[PDB]
Every structure is written in structure tokens, then in C-alpha cells.
Design a protein around this ligand. Structure first.
Ligand SMILES: [Mg+2]
Ligand SMILES: [Mg+2]
Length: 678
DNA sequence: TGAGGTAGTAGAGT
RNA sequence: UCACUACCUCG
């Protein structure tokens, strides 16, 4: 089922001979740099050298004649001087096809774009972003409309412009002025005189014209010397820290800093905060900006790139009988059923089950295979030991899950409770007390949650795919698994299960935690399906390096099971627009060779497609996406809308956020098949 | 604690 | 990229 789409991408003139072979230059430093300061230096050499020059491995490359370049000089860095000397070595062929050779011609490209944007006037330029419109306003803050840009070289050897509309948030106040009129201290702050940022620790009381700095020179006097106090009024002392060592406090003046605002627009003298846009309005705005930018780039007219898209088959979601969203099963019956025993704990004003909720479940179960039993919890949490007594009995009386009716709780308490009950072997769902059965979606979801935690498989996928087991990995340390993380798997009926890496105190071998996770997963599966997966689908947030998966990919290799490793990123797939007609769910867009885009959802703004990369395996992208897309509907606690990410990933994401704030210890007997974290 | 989407913040000292 | 907040959204 083919179709073609438009990317927020525009083709431009191919790289002429000149641009085809950049100039190369040797770089001699003084005093000798290091092995950790070496590369962070070259990037600076190319900068002081001027022109369109970039670091090309050992030395730097350039689209500028060595004439315009300052082929010799000095450079400081954290209070250390340096002396360099550039030597042309003529030129060197370069390849558009070659992974690496391209990367250079693209870096030059961004630099080419970088220099053009800086010479534009009447525009707020920040990096590669270009802002030009008054959109919102308010007590000293203004949200400007603009676009985030990017120019790189393609496989063909042509220029590629990337455009996508965006809003920037600017404060034309100054820390002092900001605070001076009833505003909290911002997390981050920026220099009024330049572009660097810092972490704002705390305000100081030291006298600005007295506080001495390395040397003896006054704090104030130090800035004034540089002219950045002219027309400004550096008030109180403020303490900040560099985003490299957020521990070493540095002195700064509140009058020379500017708060880094973040959607705290608390008034609108220009407009509503609607910072989103509909797909053909932004598409329109894209074509424009792109035409403009390309206009003053001088790279020729921008050609929007058409791409080959495929329409993936809609998934058949079943409960007792076919259904659309999970919430329907609450009336159509569940997929796999039997007696569950749900207990009720009320932490508000009265005693029983709100009529509707009781009838809701009764019907749901009546609609599904077997029927349920409904207990109430006699003890309140304050009764201390008395409470746990009733609990440990109800855990034996069958109760597999608790439904908590209570007013909003500070997460301080919300955690206490869930922790207790859980260590007692009782998953729990909360539902805030002021509740009217008008709010279908709210209690309905609450109910769907209870049953997912109770341990029921609400819906399932009618069919078979290449991988019987799909497992998603999520880490708790954005960088890697050296601090743990969890995993979630689905595949089969379709029974979903979670897994947790045993508790450590320090750092663990990243690639061992992952094997730790995968094997535990395969055991729970074997022991639950009696079979060992012929093939596995491994999903990851591509946040972490790909080698942390080495041990496991070789482990599976010694068990005889085949796999595919796919990395799923939520950012960076740009946008996709329908040529003519509307777009549908499950649009599969293959791009550069091991990558593709997935528009898993739509049904307000513009869908943000997922960018996936097949890092290992051999099954074809088509079958991969088809399956990943289908996994999009297996999320238990949705009921009224499907998530953007595949159930395994979306599950691990929320399981790593729970273990985080609850306490991995208490996760004693909790069946690895009762999704307590949803 | 209903939950999902989009949409912004972002990770040469002073 | 997580938490954050806004807005809907819920045939
Ligand atoms: Mg994640
Ligand atoms: Mg929940």
C-alpha cells in the first residue's frame, strides 16, 4: 500500500568542484595539548582561524582560502594559553557516499549556514535557530516565532536544508529586575553580555565592589572594566555554577544575568500560549521560511523532497470480542479471564463502593469469562499494625489488587502508601475522592489500571509476527545502565511482563545489567509460555550507546535464538506531510539505509514521527515497523488513546520511574506479571 | 493521584 | 532525552 509524502526537507544545488574538495590544514600547538584537551581545542582553532573551517579529525578542513584565514595565533581555555600554526597541505578528495567523508562536508555545511545567519539583520539568531515574529508578550517576557534550521550534504552530493517552525522564549528583564517584581529564582540563568549559561545556586549578600576574585581585583570592577556594566546596573551578588561542575560556586552579579524562562508565561499582552500548530499551517510556514533562508543562502531554489511511504495494516485489537480502544473491553469483556479479587481502601469520608464503580466491574467481569469478588479494607493506614493485619489476611483471601479512593496526596504521602501495600504484596490504583460518575474516562481508566495491576490481560493482538517476543529496555540514568533500569516484554495469548535489575549501591558494568535484564526476561517467558522464542525484537531509546547491548546480543547468539535490535528516538524524525489527501495511522517512511520514520499516531498540532534505526538483525524494515506499530496498541492503562511508543518501551519508561520513587526493596513477591507501576 | 498528544527548557570565568 | 507547566483531547 504505497503513498508518497513531503519531508520538512528541501533539496538545493549540488556541491560544485570547489566545495567538493575542501582545503586541509596541519595544526601545530604550543604548548603541546593532550588527549582530552586535544579535540576540544581544534574546534576552537578552526574558530579563531575564521572563515568556513571545521575540524577534520586530526587537523581542520575549510571552504575558505588560506588567505582569509589567520594561520597563526593564540587561544585561552579555562585560564591556559595556547599557540597554533596552520599549514595548508593542498587538498584531499572527499566522498558524499562515505559515511565519514560526508559528515565533514556536512559540518562545513552547518558552518556555512552559521555564518550566513549571523550576518542577517532584524532577526534573533540563536545557534541555527532563526526567530522573527512577535507572538506573545507579558510582564517582561516575549515568545518569538521562528524556525530551527539545518544544512547538510546528502548521498547525491547536494545541499539539504531542514526547516521546522519553533517558538523561542525570551526574557528582556534581568535577574534583579525579574526578582524585583515577584518572580521565583529561575533554575538556570544567562549572561546579559554573551551567550553562555549557568546554574543559579543561590543569591549572595557579599558586597559586589568588595568581593575579590583570583587576583584581588574586585568582582564589580572586573566587569565594569569590560564595559558590560554600561547602561546596566549590576545589583546584588548571585552565585552560579558551570554546567560541567555544578558544585563549584562562582560569583556573578544579578544585574548582569538574564533568567532562562520556561513556560511561566503568567499573562498575555500578545496572545495565548498555544505554542503548537496544525499540519498544513506549519507546512505552509515551513515552505516559506525555507524559501527565504534559501533566498539569502544563495544555494538555489529549495526543492521539498518527496519520499516513498507505505501504509501498514491496521491492528486487530481483541477483548472477548473485537474492539477499538482498551476502554471498550470494559463492556465487551476481557481477552483472558477468571476470578480476580479486588479490595477497596477508602481514605476519605465514607464506607462503600460508589454504586457505578461496583456495577462497572460486575458488568466487565460478567462480560468476560468468569466473575469477581469484592472486599473492602476495614483498617485505615493510621491504625498502624492493625492495618497490615487486615492486609496480610486479604492478601490470602485472594485480593490481588487495591483500589484507593482518596483526596489528592502530596507525592510525599502517595509514595508512602503504595510502598507499604506493595511490600505487603498488593498493587494499588489511586482515584481522587471528589468523584462524580459523569467523569467516565477518569474512573474508567482508573479501573483499567486496577485490572492491569490485578494481573489481567485486557486486550491482545489477533495474529502472528516475525518476533514472538518483543522486549523494551529503559535505563535510569539518561546516559546508561551503569545505575540500573528495567525491561518489559510482550509476545505470544500475548501476556506482558516486567523485569528488574537486582539492587546495587555503586556502578555496575553497563553491558552486564542489560544481559541481566534480557535473561531474566527469557526465563519468565519460558516459564510462562513453555517455549523459548525463536526470534526476539529488542527495543531501546537509543539514548545509551549501542555497545551496552553487546553481552546480551552475544548471549542470545549462544542460546540459538535470533534477534533484531532497534533503537527508538522520540525526537529527530522531522515532520511528514501528505502530498494530497489526509494521512493515516501506520505510515511507514524508509530513509537512509537502516532507518525509517513511523507515524504511529495522529487522532490538534502536527504529528511528531518516530525515528527508528535497525542496529542489528536481518529481518526487513517492513516487518520490523509493522510489528513495532502494532505493539503501539498493547498499552493496558490507556483505554482512550494509544501511546506514541511501543508498549514495551512505554512500559519500561514508567516502571523505571516507579522503582525510582518507591523503593526497589519492597518489590519482594510482586508477581512479575502484575503491572503495579502503570 | 486517568491518561495520551503536542509544545518549550537544555545539558573565551567570575 | 526525565521532570516541569499550558492546552485540549476523550466519536
Ligand atoms: Mg525511556
Ligand atoms: Mg496509574
Amino acid at each position: 500500500g504505497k503513498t508518497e509524502v513531503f519531508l520538512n526537507r528541501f533539496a538545493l544545488r549540488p556541491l560544485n568542484p570547489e566545495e567538493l574538495r575542501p582545503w586541509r590544514l596541519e595544526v601545530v600547538l604550543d604548548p603541546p595539548p593532550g588527549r582530552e584537551e586535544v579535540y576540544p581545542l581544534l574546534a576552537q582553532v578552526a574558530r579563531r582561524a575564521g572563515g568556513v573551517t571545521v575540524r577534520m579529525g586530526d587537523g581542520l578542513a575549510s571552504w575558505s582560502p588560506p588567505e582569509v584565514l589567520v594561520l597563526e595565533g593564540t587561544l585561552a581555555r579555562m585560564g591556559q594559553t595556547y599557540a597554533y600554526r596552520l599549514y595548508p597541505k593542498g587538498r584531499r578528495p572527499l566522498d558524499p557516499k562515505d559515511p565519514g567523508e560526508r559528515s565533514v562536508l556536512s559540518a562545513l555545511a552547518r558552518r556555512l549556514l552559521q555564518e550566513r545567519l549571523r550576518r542577517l539583520e532584524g532577526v534573533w539568531v540563536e545557534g541555527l535557530a532563526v526567530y522573527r515574529r512577535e507572538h506573545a508578550r507579558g510582564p517582561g517576557w516575549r515568545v518569538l516565532g521562528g524556525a530551527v534550521l539545518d544544512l547538510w550534504v546528502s548521498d547525491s552530493g547536494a545541499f539539504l536544508l531542514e526547516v521546522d517552525p519553533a517558538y523561542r522564549i525570551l526574557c528582556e528583564m534581568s535577574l534583579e529586575a525579574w526578582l524585583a517584581q515577584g518572580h521565583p529564582l529561575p533554575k538556570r540563568v544567562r549572561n546579559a553580555y554573551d551567550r553562555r549559561t549557568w546554574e543559579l545556586l543561590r543569591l549572595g549578600e557579599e558586597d559586589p565592589k568588595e568581593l575579590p576574585l583570583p587576583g584581588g581585583l574586585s568582582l564589580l570592577d572586573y566587569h565594569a572594566s569590560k564595559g558590560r556594566l554600561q547602561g546596566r546596573e549590576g545589583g546584588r551578588v548571585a552565585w552560579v555554577a558551570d554546567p560541567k561542575d555544578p558544585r563549584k560556586p562562582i560569583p556573578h552579579l544579578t544585574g548582569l544575568l538574564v533568567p532562562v524562562l520556561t513556560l511561566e508565561d503568567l499573562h498575555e499582552e500578545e496572545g495565548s500560549l498555544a505554542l503548537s500548530l496544525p499540519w498544513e499551517e506549519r507546512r505552509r510556514r515551513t515552505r516559506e521560511i525555507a524559501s527565504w533562508i534559501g533566498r539569502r543562502l544563495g544555494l538555489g531554489t529549495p526543492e521539498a523532497v518527496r519520499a516513498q511511504a507505505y501504509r501498514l495494516s491496521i491492528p486487530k485489537l481483541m477483548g472477548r470480542r473485537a474492539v477499538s480502544k482498551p476502554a471498550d473491553a470494559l463492556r465487551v469483556g476481557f481477552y483472558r479471564a477468571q476470578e480476580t479479587a479486588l479490595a477497596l481502601l477508602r481514605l476519605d469520608g465514607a464506607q462503600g463502593w460508589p454504586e457505578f464503580l461496583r456495577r462497572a466491574l460486575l458488568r466487565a467481569f460478567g462480560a468476560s469469562g468468569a466473575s469477581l469478588r469484592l472486599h473492602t479494607l476495614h483498617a485505615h493506614p493510621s491504625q498502624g499494625l492493625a492495618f497490615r493485619e487486615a492486609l496480610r489476611k486479604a492478601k490470602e483471601e485472594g485480593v490481588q489488587a487495591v483500589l484507593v479512593l482518596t483526596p489528592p496526596m502530596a507525592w510525599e504521602d502517595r509514595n508512602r502508601l503504595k510502598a507499604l501495600l506493595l511490600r505487603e504484596g498488593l498493587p494499588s490504583q489511586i482515584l481522587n475522592v471528589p468523584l462524580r460518575e459523569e467523569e467516565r474516562h477518569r474512573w474508567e481508566n482508573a479501573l483499567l489500571g486496577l485490572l492491569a495491576k490485578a494481573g489481567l490481560q485486557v486486550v491482545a493482538l489477533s495474529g502472528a509476527y516475525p518476533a514472538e517476543l518483543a522486549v523494551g529496555f529503559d535505563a535510569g540514568g539518561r546516559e546508561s545502565f551503569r545505575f540500573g533500569g528495567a525491561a518489559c516484554a510482550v509476545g505470544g495469548g500475548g501476556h506482558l511482563l516486567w523485569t528488574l535489575p537486582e539492587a546495587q549501591a555503586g556502578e555496575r558494568i553497563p553491558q552486564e545489567v542489560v544481559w541481566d535484564l534480557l535473561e531474566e526476561t527469557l526465563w519468565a517467558f519460558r516459564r510462562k509460555a513453555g517455549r523459548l522464542p525463536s526470534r526476539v525484537l529488542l527495543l531501546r531509546d537509543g539514548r545509551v550507546p549501542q555497545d551496552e547491548f553487546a553481552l546480551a546480543l552475544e548471549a542470545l547468539a549462544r542460546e540459538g535464538i535470533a534477534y533484531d535490535l532497534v533503537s527508538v528516538r522520540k525526537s529527530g524524525g522531522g515532520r511528514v506531510y501528505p502530498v494530497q489527501g489526509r494521512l493515516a495511522d501506520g505510515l511507514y517512511v524508509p530513509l537512509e539505509d537502516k532507518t525509517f520514520l513511523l507515524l504511529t499516531v495522529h487522532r490538534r498540532g502536527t504529528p511528531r514521527p518516530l525515528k527508528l534505526v535497525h542496529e542489528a538483525g536481518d529481518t526487513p524494515l517492513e516487518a520490523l515497523a509493522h510489528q513495532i506499530f502494532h505493539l503501539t496498541r498493547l498499552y493496558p492503562a490507556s483505554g482512550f488513546a494509544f501511546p506514541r511508543l511501543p508498549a514495551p518501551l512505554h512500559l519500561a519508561d514508567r516502571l523505571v520511574k516507579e522503582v525510582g520513587r518507591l523503593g526497589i526493596r519492597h518489590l519482594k513477591e510482586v508477581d512479575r506479571e502484575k503491572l503495579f507501576f502503570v
